[PDB]
C-alpha cells in the first residue's frame, strides 16, 4: 500500500497556464483547450494552446494531402466499395514506379505516379515540420536539441525513401505506403541483402533501440523513486543539486560502479535514442550500394 | 573513494538478509548478501562458459556458443557437453539476475528511495525467463530456448521467426515494436527538451520548466509535464517488454500457423469475403 | 577487402569511444573529484579527467552556477567511521532523523523558493492560489493523518500545489499543538476516511522541519522536510509492527 506515484491520487486544477511568451508571435497561438481529467491521472490535464504559423499550416496542409493521396488510391483499389475499403484497409498499398521507370517522373498516375505525388507531399510535410521544431525553440530562447534529434529520424526516412533509391537508380527501391506492404518490404529488404542481422550498423541500431528502453526504464524509474524529494524538477536540480539528485546518483554508483548527473543523464538519453536512426540510416544506405550480402561480407571481414 | 556528497549516505542498515554481515562497499560497489550471491552465480556461470568453450575448442568470443539440449531431451537433464552446461549456466544467470534485483532493493532501502528500479528490471528478467524457461516448458523441451552465443542467438531469432512466416504479422509483436519505437521517440524528445532548457540559446539565462511546457504545447498542443514524462518513459519501455514476452509466450503454444493467418479472420468475414475486387475478394 | 562499409564501421566505433568519453566526463560535473572517507582528495580519480567548467546563468537574478567547481557539504555531518579501512558504513553519532543523515539526509540547497518562469513562487498553499481546487480523487482536506503506529497525528488543513504543473506536492497537516508541517504528497496514501503515512509514527510528526513562512517553502526547507520523512522508513521502523 505504499504509494508508487504511477497514477495521481488527488488531481488539482487551477487557471489555464497560458505559457511563456519570450519572442513567440502570440498572433499564431490558439486559445487554450479543455482539461482532461482522464489525462490528469497520468500527466497534465490541460490541453492547448497550440502554435499555428506559416510552417505549421503548410506542414499540416501538405501532410493531409499525403494522407489523402494515399486514401484516394485506397478507395480506387477498393473499387469505391466502402465495405471492401474497411475489409482490405491494411492490404492496400500505394507502390512506387516499377524499376523500368528508373528515377523518371514519367510513370503514369496509376503505376507509380501517385506514389511520387504522395512522396512530394510527405517530403514537404516533414521538412516544414522540422523547420517548426527549430523555430518553436528559437522563439522561446531554447537550445536546438529537439530539431537536431529530429534530424536523426529524418535521416533514416530520407535514406529509405529518397537517398538510397536515387543511388540505386530507381524509385522502385523505395518503401510503399501500406500497413502490411511496408512490412513485406522490410522482410524482403533483409532477404535481398543477405540477412540484415549481419549488417553491423543494424546490430548497433538494435543495441541502441534496446538500450533506449533499458535507459528510459532506468531513468523513469529512478526519477519516480526520488519523486518523494522533488526529483522530477530536473532543471532546478541541475541548477541546485538536491538530495533527490544525490540519491539517484548513488543508487547507480552503488549498483554498477558509476553514475550520472541530473543534466548528464539527458545527454546519455538523447544520444542513446538518436543513435538508433543514425546507425540505422547508415546501415540501410550501404545496403545494395556498397554491400549486396551482409552475411557474406561479414564472413570476409571477421564475423 | 567517495563522491564529495556521498559519505552522509553510507550508513548501516537496509539489508534484507544477513544483518550487518555483508553491509559494506568495495570501492563504489555496495555488496550486501545479494552482492555475494551475484558474485557466486556470475563467477560460476562464467567458469562454466569457459568450460564449454574448452569443450568447443575456441577462445574466440565471436565463436563461443553454449547450446541448450537437443529437443529429444524434452525437459530432462542433459550431459554437460550436450546441454547440461547450458542448463546450469541458465540457473546461474537466473540466480545472478534475481540477486542483482534484490541487491538493488537493499540499495533502495539504505537510500530511502522508491523501489521502481528493481521492479522495472524484473520485467527484463521475466522476458529472459519467458525465452529460456516459460516458453520451453510450455512447448516441452529446453531445446526451444536460445543458445548463448553472440551470433548463434541471432540465428535462433531468425530461425524461430521464420518458422511462422514473416514474424511481423504477430500482432502482440506489432504492439511491442510500437512501444519500442515510441519509447525511443519519447527518450529522444525528453533528453532534447531538458537539455534545450538547461542549455538555452547563447546569450540567455537558463530556461525554466514553464519553457519546456510552452515548447511542447506550441509544438503539438499538449505537454505531459515533468512527472508525466518519466511515468511515460517507464510505461512505454515496460509495455514494450511485456508485449515482447506475450508475443513469444503464445508462439508455438497456442499459435502454430503462419502469423499472417491471424488477420485473415478480418479478411474472410462472411459479409464481405466474396465481394469482387480489392485485395481479399 | 577493407571497403567503405569497413571504413564506416571502424570510424563509428572510434566515434562511439569518443562519445562515451565525452558523456562520462559530462557526468562528472557534480561530486568530483572523488574523496577519501576523511574528506581529503582521493589519490585514484580513475581514467576519465574532470570536465572543464561550464556556467549556467540562473534566471530571476539568482546568479550563476559554475560546474565543476569547489564543493563542500556546507553543513555538519554527524557521522563517524566504523573502520580505519575504507568501504565500511559510517554510523550516526546522534539522532539520524534530527541530524539529517543516512536516508534522512538533506542537501544545503538555496534557502529560497523555486520560482516559475514568471518569477513567482512555484509552490503555494491552495488557500493562496486563486482558483485552485481538487478536481478528481478524494479531497484529503479535513481528514485525519495517521502514522505507522496507527495513531492520529493531526488534520489536513491545506494542499500545497505546484502551480505550473498543477500538481499536489504537499499536505499541510495541523498538529495537536496547532502548528503545521508539510507532508510530501508522494509519501501519503489518501483513503476514504484518513491519510495514512507509513514513513512516520505519530510522535515523529512534530520533528518534521518547519518552514519559516506560512505561504511559501524554500528549496532548503523542502529538502529537510522530504529527507526527514523518507528517513522514517528506516529510523521509525522499530515502531512499524
Ligand atoms: C531480446 C530478443 C532476443 C535477442 C535479439 C538480438 C538481436 C536481433 C540483436 C541482439 C544484439 C545483442 N544482444 Mg541479444 N537477444 C536476446 C537476448 C540477449 C541477452 C539475454 C541474457 O537475454 C543478452 C545478454 C543479449 C546480448 C546482446 C549483445 C551481444 C548485443 C547488443 C545488446 C544491447 O546492447 O542491448 C541493450 C543493452 C545495453 C546497451 C547494455 C549493455 C549490454 C552488453 C553489450 C551485453 C553484453 C553481453 C555479453 C557479450 C554476454 C554475456 C557476458 C557474460 C560475462 C558471459 N541478448 C533474445 C534472444 N540481440 C545485437 C547484436 O549486435 O548481436 C550481435 C542484435 O543485432
Ligand atoms: C525480416 C525483417 C529483418 C529486418 C529488417 C529491417 C529493415 C529493412 C530495417 C530495419 C530497421 C531496424 N530494425 Mg531490423 N529486421 C530484422 C530484425 C530485427 C530485430 C530482431 C529482434 O531480430 C530487431 C530488434 C530489429 C530492430 C530494428 C531497429 C533497431 C531499426 C529501426 C529503428 C527505428 O527506430 O525505426 C523507426 C524509425 C523510423 C522509420 C524513422 C521515421 C522518421 C519519419 C520522419 C517519421 C515520419 C512520420 C510521418 C509524417 C507520419 C506522421 C503521422 C502523424 C503523426 C499522425 N530488427 C530482420 C532480420 N530492420 C531499419 C534500420 O535502420 O536498419 C538498419 C530498417 O530500415
Ligand atoms: C524500421 C524498418 C521499417 C518499418 C518496420 C516496422 C515494423 C516491423 C513494424 C512497424 C510498425 C509501424 N510502422 Mg513502420 N517501418 C518503417 C517505416 C515507417 C514509416 C516511415 C516514415 O518511414 C512510418 C510512418 C511507419 C509507420 C508505422 C506504424 C503503422 C506502426 C507503428 C510505428 C510507431 O511506433 O511509431 C512511433 C510514433 C508514434 C506513436 C507517433 C504517432 C504515429 C502514427 C500512429 C503513425 C501513423 C502512420 C499512418 C498514416 C497510419 C494510418 C492508419 C490507418 C491505416 C488509417 N513505419 C521501415 C520501412 N514498422 C509496427 C506495426 O504495428 O505495424 C503494423 C510494426 O510491427
Ligand atoms: C527474422 C527475425 C524476425 C523476428 C523474430 C523474433 C523472435 C523469434 C523474437 C523477437 C523478439 C523481439 N523482436 Mg522481432 N523479428 C523480426 C523483426 C523485428 C523488427 C523489425 C524492424 O523488423 C523489430 C523492431 C523487432 C522487435 C522485437 C522486439 C519486440 C523483441 C526483442 C526485445 C525483447 O524481447 O526484449 C526483452 C529483453 C530481454 C530478453 C533482455 C534480458 C536481459 C537480462 C534480464 C539481463 C542480462 C544481463 C547481461 C548478461 C549482463 C552482461 C554483463 C554486463 C553488461 C556488465 N523484430 C523478424 C520478422 N523477434 C523477441 C521477443 O519478443 O522476446 C521476448 C523474440 O524472441
Ligand atoms: C531515434 C529517433 C526517434 C524519433 C525522433 C523524433 N521524431 C520526432 C522528433 C524526434 C526527436 C520530433 O521533434 C518530431 C515531433 O514533433 O515529435 C513530437 C518527430 C515526429 N516523429 C513522428 C513520427 C514517427 N517517429 C518515428 C520514429 C522515431 N522518431 C525514432 C524512434 C516513427 C516510427 C515509424 O517509429 C514515427 C511514425 C511524428 C509524431 C513527428 C513528425 C511530425 C511530422 O513531420 O509531421 C508531418 C505531418 C503532418 C503535420 C500531418 C500528417 C497528416 C495526418 C497523417 C492526418 C491523419 C488524421 C485525420 C485524417 C485528419 C483529418 C482532418 C480533417 C478536418 C481535414
Ligand atoms: C524492461 C525494460 C528494459 C530493461 C530494464 C532494466 N535492465 C536493467 C535494469 C533495468 C530497469 C537494471 O536495474 C539493471 C542494471 O543494473 O542496469 C544498469 C539492468 C540490466 N540490464 C542489462 C542488460 C540488458 N538489458 C536489456 C534489456 C532491457 N532492460 C529492457 C529492454 C538487454 C537487451 C538484450 O535488450 C540487455 C543485454 C544489464 C546491463 C543489467 C543487469 C546486470 C546484471 O544482472 O548483473 C548481474 C549478472 C552479471 C554481472 C553476469 C551474469 C553472467 C551469467 C551468469 C552468464 C551469462 C549468461 C547469459 C544468459 C549469456 C547470454 C549471451 C548473449 C550473447 C545472448
Ligand atoms: C537522474 O538520475 C539518474 C542518475 O543519477 C543522477 C544515474 O546515475 C542514472 C544511471 C544511468 C547512467 C549512469 C547512464 C549510463 C548507463 C547506461 C548506458 C546503461 C547501460 C549500463 C551498463 C552497460 C553498465 C553495466 C555495468 C554493470 C552491470 C556492473 C558491472 C559489475 C561489476 C564490474 C562488478 C559488480 C559488483 C558485484 C558483482 C556486486 C558485489 C561486489 C563484490 C566485489 C562482491 C540514471 C538512470 C538516473 O536517472
Ligand atoms: C476516409 O478515407 C479518406 C480518403 C478520407 C482517407 O484519408 C483515408 C486515408 C488512409 C486510409 C491513409 C492510409 C495511409 C497509410 C496506410 C500510410 C502508411 C505509411 C507507412 C506505413 C509509411 C511507409 C514508409 C514511408 C517512407 C519511408 C517514405 C519516404 C518518403 C521520401 C523520403 C520522400 C521522397 C520524395 C520524393 C520521391 C518526391 C521527390 C520530390 C521532391 C520535391 C524532393
Ligand atoms: C554520412 C553519414 C553521417 C550522418 C548524416 C547526417 C545525419 C543527420 C544527423 C544529425 C546528428 C544527430 C543529432 C545530434 C545529437 C543530438 C543533438 C545534440 O546533443 O547536439 C545539439 C546541441 O549542440 C545543441 O544545439 P545548439 O542549441 O544549436 O547548440
Ligand atoms: C578514448 C577517447 C578518445 C576516443 C577517440 C577520439 C574520438 C573521435 C570522435 C569523437 C567525438 C564524439 C563527440 C560527441 C559529442 C560532441 C560534443 C557536443 O555535444 O558539443 C556541443 C556541446 O558542447 C553543446 O551542447 P549543449 O550544451 O547541450 O547545447
Ligand atoms: C488543442 C490541441 C490538441 C491536443 C493534442 C494532444 C497531442 C498529444 C501528443 C503527444 C504528447 C506526448 C509527448 C511525449 C514527449 C514529451 C517530451 C517531454 O520531456 O515532455 C516533458 C513535459 O512535457 C515538460 O517537462
Ligand atoms: C503537387 C504535385 C507534385 C508533383 C511532383 C511529382 C511529379 C509526379 C509526376 C506524375 C506524372 C503523371 N504524368 C501524367 C505526367 O505522367
Ligand atoms: C550512448 C550509449 C552507448 C552504448 C553502446 C552499446 C554498444 C553495444 C554493442 C553492440 C554490438 C553490435 N555489433 C554488431 C557492432 O557488434
Ligand atoms: C556501454 C555504455 C556504458 C559505458 C560505461 C562508462 C563507464 C564509466 C566508468 C567511470 C568510473 C567512475 N568512477 C568510479 C571512476 O568514478
Ligand atoms: Fe529526466
Numbering used by the authors:
A (entry chain M): 1 to 303
B (entry chain L): 1 to 281
C (entry chain H): 9 to 249
Sentences from the paper on this structure:
The RC from the purple bacterium Rhodobacter sphaeroides is an integral membrane pigment–protein complex that consists of three subunits and ten cofactors. The cofactors are arranged in two membrane-spanning branches, A and B, around an axis of pseudo-twofold symmetry. Only one, the A branch, is active in photosynthetic electron transfer. The RC includes two bacteriochlorophylls (BChls), PA and PB, combined into a special pair P, two monomeric BChls BA and BB, two bacteriopheophytins (BPhe) HA and HB, two quinones and a nonheme Fe atom [Allen et al., 1987; Fig. 1(a)]. Being the primary electron donor, the BChl dimer P is a crucial component in the RC, and the redox potential of P is a critical factor in the efficient functioning of the RC.
To explore the structural consequences of the F(M197)H mutation in detail, X-ray crystal structures of the mutant RC were obtained under two different conditions: (i) cryo-conditions using a single crystal and (ii) multi-crystal crystallography at room temperature. The corresponding structures were determined to resolutions of 2.1 and 2.04 Å, respectively. The structures obtained using the different techniques are in good agreement for the positions of the atoms of the main chain. Changes in the structure of the mutant RC were mainly confined to the side chain of the M197 His residue, to the C2-acetyl group of BChl PB, a conserved water molecule and Asp L155. It is important to mention that there is a significant difference between the F(M197)H mutant structures obtained at 100 K and at room temperature. In both of these structures we observed a rotation of the acetyl group of BChl PB relative to the plane of the macrocycle that differs from that seen in the WT structure, but in the case of the room-temperature mutant there was a more pronounced rotation compared with the cooled structure. Since Phe is bulkier than His, the Phe→His substitution created no steric problems, and good structural conservation was observed throughout the bulk of the protein–cofactor system. The electron-density maps are consistent with the donation of a hydrogen bond from the imidazole group of His M197 to the C2-acetyl carbonyl group of BChl PB. As a result of the F(M197)H mutation, BChl PB finds itself connected to the extensive hydrogen-bonding network that pre-existed in wild-type RC. The involvement of His M197 in the hydrogen-bonding network also appears to be related to stabilization of the F(M197)H RC structure.
